[PDB]
Amino acid sequence: AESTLGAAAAQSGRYFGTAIASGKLGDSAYTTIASREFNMVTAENEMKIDATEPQRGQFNFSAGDRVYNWAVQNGKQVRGHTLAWHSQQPGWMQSLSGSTLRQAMIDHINGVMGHYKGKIAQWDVVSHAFSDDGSGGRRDSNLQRTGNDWIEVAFRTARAADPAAKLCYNDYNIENWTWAKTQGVYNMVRDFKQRGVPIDCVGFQSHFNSGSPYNSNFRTTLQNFAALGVDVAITELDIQGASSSTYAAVTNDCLAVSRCLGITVWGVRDTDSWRSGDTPLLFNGDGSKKAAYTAVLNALNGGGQIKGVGSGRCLDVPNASTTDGTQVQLYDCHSATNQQWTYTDAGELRVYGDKCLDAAGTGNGTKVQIYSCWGGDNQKWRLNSDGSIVGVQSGLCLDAVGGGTANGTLIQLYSCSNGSNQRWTRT
Numbered sequence: 001a002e003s004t005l006g007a008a009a010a011q012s013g014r015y016f017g018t019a020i021a022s023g024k025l026g027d028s029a030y031t032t033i034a035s036r037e038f039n040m041v042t043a044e045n046e047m048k049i050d051a052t053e054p055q056r057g058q059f060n061f062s063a064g065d066r067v068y069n070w071a072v073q074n075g076k077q078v079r080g081h082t083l084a085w086h087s088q089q090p091g092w093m094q095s096l097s098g099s100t101l102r103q104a105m106i107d108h109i110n111g112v113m114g115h116y117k118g119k120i121a122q123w124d125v126v127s128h129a130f131s132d133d134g135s136g137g138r139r140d141s142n143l144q145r146t147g148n149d150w151i152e153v154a155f156r157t158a159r160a161a162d163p164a165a166k167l168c169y170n171d172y173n174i175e176n177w178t179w180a181k182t183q184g185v186y187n188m189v190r191d192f193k194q195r196g197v198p199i200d201c202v203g204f205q206s207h208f209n210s211g212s213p214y215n216s217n218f219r220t221t222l223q224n225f226a227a228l229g230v231d232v233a234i235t236e237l238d239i240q241g242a243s244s245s246t247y248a249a250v251t252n253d254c255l256a257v258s259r260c261l262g263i264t265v266w267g268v269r270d271t272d273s274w275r276s277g278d279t280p281l282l283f284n285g286d287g288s289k290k291a292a293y294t295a296v297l298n299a300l301n302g303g304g305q306i307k308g309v310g311s312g313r314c315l316d317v318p319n320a321s322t323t324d325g326t327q328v329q330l331y332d333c334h335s336a337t338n339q340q341w342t343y344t345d346a347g348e349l350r351v352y353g354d355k356c357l358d359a360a361g362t363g364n365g366t367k368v369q370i371y372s373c374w375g376g377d378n379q380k381w382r383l384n385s386d387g388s389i390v391g392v393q394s395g396l397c398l399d400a401v402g403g404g405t406a407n408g409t410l411i412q413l414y415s416c417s418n419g420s421n422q423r424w425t426r427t
């Protein structure tokens with residue numbers, strides 16, 4: 001299987017997951033995409049401390065189970081998130097400290113893991129344990145104040161509670177190998193493995209943006225941790241701007257590491273993202289697949305002019321015009337600039353540098369032309385493996401009008417038919 005993310009990842013023994021919000025399980029558009037595309041689920045908030053133990057000793061798995069059941073019922077495994085960390089703690093726990101806190105932490109772990117014993121693939125036992133101050137040390141938290149050994153204690157407690165779950169340490173900004181935070185975690189995990197502390201995986205949240213950008217050395221980081229004898233997982237991936245290239249690079253980084261279990265993107269549609277402003281996911285609010293989706297799928301499936309297969313002619317802007325609204329056509333292939341198209345990370349097909357292949361509408365017969373680039377979804381395109389080029393907004397295929405093949409044949413949008421007049425090759 002290779003038309004969906006999860007199925008494609010499965011080809012190499014991995015998974016492709018997302019974060020599920022219980023409040024959206026009633027949204028048909030949401031669940032249609034989620035159930036179809038992913039085979040691993042993480043509760044976005046339903047399994048956190050405050051949600052699972054609102055009152056000390058008073059556990060509530062209502063929201064957590066709703067997500068877990070939806071996942072398993074729809075063929076997805078589940079990553080437990082999260083058992084012990086400083087954020088989103090319930091009121092009662094926030095007012096705790098010292099030995100009473102340590103005991104509360106242990107009790108919480110036993111209660112939650114006990115409830116899901118044997119049903120969880122991976123548990124983010126501890127997360128956000130390190131600081132961003134650049135020192136490479138632990139962050140000052142109620143948990144940390146109970147003693148530096150709290151992390152180790154949490155893992156040992158977890159192993160005993162559910163020996164079948166892979167136990168991960170999860171954090172952010174630990175992707176770039178040169179960062180001090182990354183080294184602090186690396187040193188901790190190494191020490192743990194040397195002393196026999198039960199840790200099976202390290203989760204890299206992968207929340208990339210211009211503030212903490214993706215760097216190719218992320219693969220090295222994954223490989224270095226893998227070499228320590230633990231599995232690695234990309235747990236909450238989202239990329240500011242959703243560059244097709246960056247999304248493909250991250251996907252390939254996991255595929256290049258034997259120990260990388262899989263990749264989870266933090267949400268389904270940009271509208272469901274905790275950072276919608278950064279439009280960091282693989283699907284748009286209207287549910288359309290972004291160019292990034294195609295890039296990720298292509299990667300999971302095993303990794304200039306635009307020539308029409310059926311006509312043998314190239315996508316051409318009539319008389320090298322630069323006028324907005326000029327409908328494109330088929331023409332004998334040559335080296336002029338009016339036949340050179342660049343596919344950008346934003347999914348555009350540019351010509352002349354600042355002009356974009358543009359759909360003047362959404363229905364069949366819609367004119368395909370050039371127009372000033374501005375970021376519209378009607379200027380976004382998906383270059384599919386079968387040679388088809390689909391408009392993001394319309395969901396229709398680039399089509400040579402009436403199957404025409406002669407110079408001057410115009411280009412339009414039309415329901416995809418896999419016809420020769422809808423297949424294109426770049427050469």
Ligand SMILES: [N-]=[N+]=[N-][C]1O[C][C](O[C]2O[C][C]([O])[C]([O])[C]2[O])[C]([O])[C]1[O]
Pocket residue numbers: 044045127172205207236274
């Ligand atoms: N970086 N880091 N980390 C992360 O972040 C994000 C989160 O999630 C969130 O939380 C909050 C709420 O509100 C929302 O919805 C969600 O999404 C996670 O958990 C972490 O880890």
